[PDB]
């Protein structure tokens, strides 16, 4: 609680400004259908918000994973990065944010160390 700063709040915030038209924009704002225009940069934007460095979309989608079950966000039928905000911040603050507020930290830790340079500190081969 305290103050919502979850992924969906930030991404929805991007949807409220024409700056990010090349990053994300509304396809049907009333249906809450929105298109992620530049997923790499969208991930970077959210990384920026989450004080994270190298956030790729495949790396960001891990947070979205939960939203699919929370039926917050779905992928539109027969689309790429066309999604649907089934519910907005106001609706999501019904209670399911507790796992999300907890998860964002975790998803940012689940994967590799936001690797920029493929280094071998030990015989590994990282799951980039």
Coordinates of C-alpha atoms in Angstrom, one line a residue:
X1 CA 0.0 0.0 0.0
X2 CA 1.1 3.5 0.9
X3 CA 1.3 4.7 -2.7
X4 CA 0.7 2.7 -5.8
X5 CA 3.7 2.7 -8.1
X6 CA 3.1 -0.6 -9.8
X7 CA 3.8 -1.5 -13.5
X8 CA 0.2 -1.0 -14.5
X9 CA 0.1 2.5 -13.0
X10 CA 3.2 3.6 -14.8
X11 CA 2.2 2.0 -18.1
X12 CA -1.2 3.6 -17.9
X13 CA 0.6 6.9 -17.1
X14 CA 2.5 6.5 -20.4
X15 CA -0.9 6.1 -22.0
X16 CA -1.9 9.5 -20.7
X17 CA 0.8 11.4 -22.6
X18 CA 1.5 11.8 -26.3
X19 CA 5.3 11.7 -25.5
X20 CA 5.3 8.0 -25.5
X21 CA 3.4 7.6 -28.7
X22 CA 6.3 5.7 -30.1
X23 CA 6.5 3.6 -27.0
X24 CA 2.8 2.9 -26.2
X25 CA -0.6 4.3 -27.3
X26 CA -4.3 3.7 -27.0
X27 CA -6.0 1.7 -29.7
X28 CA -9.3 1.8 -28.1
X29 CA -9.2 3.8 -24.9
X30 CA -12.8 3.2 -23.9
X31 CA -12.5 -0.6 -24.3
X32 CA -9.2 -0.1 -22.5
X33 CA -7.4 -1.7 -25.5
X34 CA -3.8 -0.4 -25.7
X35 CA -0.9 -1.2 -27.9
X36 CA 2.7 -1.4 -26.8
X37 CA 4.4 0.3 -29.7
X38 CA 8.0 -0.1 -28.7
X39 CA 8.2 -2.9 -26.2
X40 CA 12.0 -2.6 -25.7
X41 CA 11.7 1.1 -24.8
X42 CA 8.5 0.4 -22.8
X43 CA 10.4 -2.0 -20.7
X44 CA 13.2 0.5 -20.4
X45 CA 10.7 3.2 -19.3
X46 CA 9.4 0.9 -16.6
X47 CA 12.9 0.0 -15.7
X48 CA 13.5 3.7 -15.4
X49 CA 10.6 3.9 -13.0
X50 CA 11.8 0.8 -11.1
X51 CA 15.3 2.3 -10.8
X52 CA 16.4 -0.6 -13.0
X53 CA 19.1 -0.6 -15.7
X54 CA 18.8 -3.0 -18.6
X55 CA 15.1 -3.9 -18.7
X56 CA 14.1 -5.7 -21.9
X57 CA 10.4 -6.3 -22.7
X58 CA 10.8 -10.1 -22.3
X59 CA 12.3 -9.0 -19.0
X60 CA 9.3 -6.7 -18.3
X61 CA 6.7 -9.1 -19.4
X62 CA 7.5 -11.2 -16.3
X63 CA 5.6 -8.6 -14.3
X64 CA 2.7 -8.6 -16.8
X65 CA 2.6 -12.4 -16.3
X66 CA 0.8 -11.9 -13.0
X67 CA -1.6 -9.3 -14.5
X68 CA -2.8 -12.0 -16.9
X69 CA -4.0 -14.1 -13.9
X70 CA -5.2 -11.0 -12.1
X71 CA -7.2 -10.3 -15.2
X72 CA -5.8 -6.8 -15.1
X73 CA -4.3 -7.1 -18.6
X74 CA -5.0 -9.5 -21.4
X75 CA -3.6 -9.9 -24.9
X76 CA -6.1 -9.0 -27.5
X77 CA -7.3 -11.8 -29.7
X78 CA -5.0 -12.3 -32.7
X79 CA -2.7 -9.5 -31.8
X80 CA 1.0 -8.9 -31.0
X81 CA 1.4 -6.4 -28.1
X82 CA -2.2 -5.3 -28.2
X83 CA -3.5 -5.6 -24.8
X84 CA -6.6 -4.8 -22.7
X85 CA -6.7 -3.1 -19.3
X86 CA -9.6 -5.1 -18.0
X87 CA -9.3 -2.9 -14.9
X88 CA -7.4 0.2 -14.1
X89 CA -5.4 1.3 -10.9
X90 CA -8.7 2.3 -9.3
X91 CA -10.1 -1.1 -9.9
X92 CA -6.9 -3.0 -9.1
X93 CA -6.5 -1.3 -5.7
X94 CA -9.4 -3.5 -4.6
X95 CA -6.7 -5.6 -2.9
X96 CA -4.6 -7.6 -5.4
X97 CA -1.8 -5.1 -5.4
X98 CA -0.1 -6.7 -2.4
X99 CA 1.3 -9.5 -4.4
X100 CA 2.3 -7.1 -7.2
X101 CA 4.0 -4.6 -5.0
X102 CA 5.9 -7.6 -3.7
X103 CA 6.4 -9.2 -7.1
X104 CA 8.0 -6.2 -8.9
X105 CA 11.0 -6.5 -6.6
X106 CA 11.1 -10.2 -7.3
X107 CA 10.6 -10.2 -11.1
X108 CA 13.5 -7.6 -11.2
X109 CA 15.5 -10.2 -9.3
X110 CA 14.1 -13.5 -10.9
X111 CA 16.1 -13.1 -14.0
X112 CA 19.7 -12.3 -14.8
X113 CA 21.6 -9.4 -13.3
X114 CA 20.3 -7.1 -16.1
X115 CA 23.5 -8.2 -17.9
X116 CA 24.8 -5.7 -20.5
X117 CA 28.1 -7.4 -21.1
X118 CA 28.0 -11.3 -21.3
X119 CA 30.7 -12.0 -18.7
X120 CA 32.0 -15.2 -17.3
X121 CA 32.9 -14.8 -13.6
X122 CA 32.5 -18.5 -13.4
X123 CA 31.8 -21.3 -16.0
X124 CA 28.1 -20.4 -16.3
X125 CA 26.5 -19.2 -19.5
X126 CA 23.8 -17.0 -18.1
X127 CA 20.1 -17.4 -18.8
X128 CA 19.9 -14.0 -20.6

